[PDB]
A and B are shown apart, each in its own frame.
Chain A
């Protein structure tokens, strides 16, 4: 009943054809789906399971295990905020405060328009530039609220 748009199906097929075995493509596929929809639709997994030649149970288990994937909230832009030791030391809390001031939301929340979701994450591997955040694939050092406001204004 649920079916991938052809352009997305094409991209999933590229991934599945890329590695020697189809099932190796499962994470690339799930990244692609999340990119396309703004989350992982529950209904997407059975079709994905079929393309990978895997039981649905397997695909469900994988989505549950890997923290980057989100089956619950659609968001156009995921603001991943590092909450691990170095960012905490150097001012995660200031970043979160600035985010609440600008966007009106806290970690785990999505703005009402579905535009931004704040996602607390473990160390992003940019600790010298603490406190670190990502907006989808883009990554930044937080300097101040004025600076953050300008960065976020680039995402429409």
Chain B
């Protein structure tokens, strides 16, 4: 059938793994996927014990691609120490500013994700899996529903999959406008038909998740690696990139670069290389002023030689790269980040609820030149006091990037105060 219009995001790979098909901006259906050896990793996995699959995924060094970088195998191992039934959830909520890596897998190579979900589900003994996709990805939703039907018709889903005795259904759920539903516990609340309110952790979902049962939540990109780990083996997988932070990584690059798009690169690539070697440099060859790591971190032009890995001095996050150049007003950009958090706090925790609102309200006053001295002092205070009593990561980071701009670009902020 036809799907809603999608802009054709540029995609480029040096590894030819996650973007082997998704480098071309169109839906690759099951016959095309099968041609390339699609679903053969699944067939292999079904001839392995769950324990063995968990072991390979552990030894691969795969880490969560949804922002927290938790080791995937270890997560699975934790889930299976708890009595079943268990649930598997694919997190396709991708709503962080700058971040558009997951959609190109969903929309162009859905079977890569589906194959990974089935293997992952088998590994943890889940017979019921979910994809939670943000509501603003309607094409991805319809594409996934159709791909799941294709997989059923070829016997990769349903009961007694390929004679293995393993049963699996994959349900596709849709979000409805809340960034917070990407937080794994709020996602589960939404799957249970409620508001997206994060739960106090611990317990972690792997102990008590959907309907209080052991639940593994993994990001789309994380899951898209599973086929490769089974296909190649963990040893060969670990030979991709540097041996500590191994494997392909997707980098959604936007803002003031000549070639904005998604880049599949190893994690020893530097930030400078991402911008200048791969993304074609800056618009107008203007000087880089800052890189926003989505809405999380702000790196200065003195920090471009860092690796795009999960190391302490590395870029980290989700590899989201928003490039600002010399003429971009840092305070204007900070206001946009404040506005995001204002719009997305769920309001459960008081300092988060009040702090996200006040941070944006006062920063807007500052930007417009209408801030009193008290407003300035209040802004500083609030920025530093969003995190207390927070039960999820949003409250913990709502002031982080903005504080970094205050520290790294004092001269520009001072201009607004004077």
Contact = CB atoms under 8 A, between A and B. Distances in A.
B97 to A, nearest CB: 4
Nearest to B10: A128
Interface stretch (A4-12, A66-74, A99-107, A110-118): A66-74
Interface in A107-151: 121-130, 132, 134, 136-141
Interface in B226-255: 252-255
User: For the complex, would chain A's binding face be called helix, strand, loop or mixed by DSSP majority?
Assistant: mixed
Nearest to B138: A137
Contacts of B344: 122
Contacts of B256: 89
Interface residues of A, number: 48
Contact of B253 (A25, A31, A67, A128): A128
Given A30-B176, A85-B295, A123-B95, A90 B255 contact: yes
B195 A62 contact: yes
Contacts of B98: 85-86, 123, 127
Given A85-B97, A86-B254, A89-B255, A140 B191 contact: no
A106 B380 CA distance: 33
Nearest to B292: A85
B176 A128 contact: no
A54 B337 CA distance: 37
Interface string B98-119: 1110110000000000000000
Contacts of B171: 18-20, 24
B260 interface: yes
A91 B344 CA distance: 23
Interface in B348-370: none
Nearest to B181: A66
A128 B252 contact: yes
Contact of A62 (B4, B173, B194): B194
A122 B345 CA distance: 13
A75 interface: no
A69 B195 contact: no
Contacts of B324: 89
Pairs A-B, 9 closest by C-beta atoms: A67-B177, A66-B176, A23-B193, A128-B260, A68-B177, A137-B4, A138-B5, A127-B254, A129-B7
B88 interface: no
Nearest to A68: B177
B34 interface: no
A140 B97 CA distance: 17
A80 B136 contact: yes
Nearest to A121: B136
Contacts of A24: 171, 173, 191-193
Contacts of B332: 88
B139 A66 contact: no
Interface of A: 18-21, 23-28, 30-31, 52, 54, 58, 61-62, 65-69, 80, 83-86, 88-90, 121-130, 132, 134, 136-141
B409 interface: no
B333 interface: yes
A64 to B, nearest CB: 9
A90 B190 CA distance: 33
24 contacts: A19-B173, A31-B135, A66-B135, A66-B177, A67-B343, A68-B136, A68-B177, A69-B177, A84-B339, A85-B337, A86-B255, A86-B322, A122-B95, A122-B344, A123-B99, A126-B100, A126-B103, A127-B260, A128-B252, A128-B260, A128-B262, A130-B255, A138-B5, A139-B4
Contacts of A122: 95, 97, 179, 340, 343-344
A30 B174 CA distance: 11
B336 interface: yes
Contacts of A67: 176-178, 343
Contacts of B174: 27-28, 31
Nearest to B211: A21
A41 B302 CA distance: 54
B196 interface: yes
A18 to B, nearest CB: 7
Nearest to A22: B193
B6 interface: yes
A85 B7 contact: no
A128 B292 CA distance: 14
Interface in B1-29: 4-10
B173 A28 contact: yes
Nearest to A127: B254
Contacts of B9: 126, 128-129
Given A122-B344, A132-B7, A137-B139, A85 B178 contact: no
A54 B193 contact: yes
B412 interface: no
A123 to B, nearest CB: 4
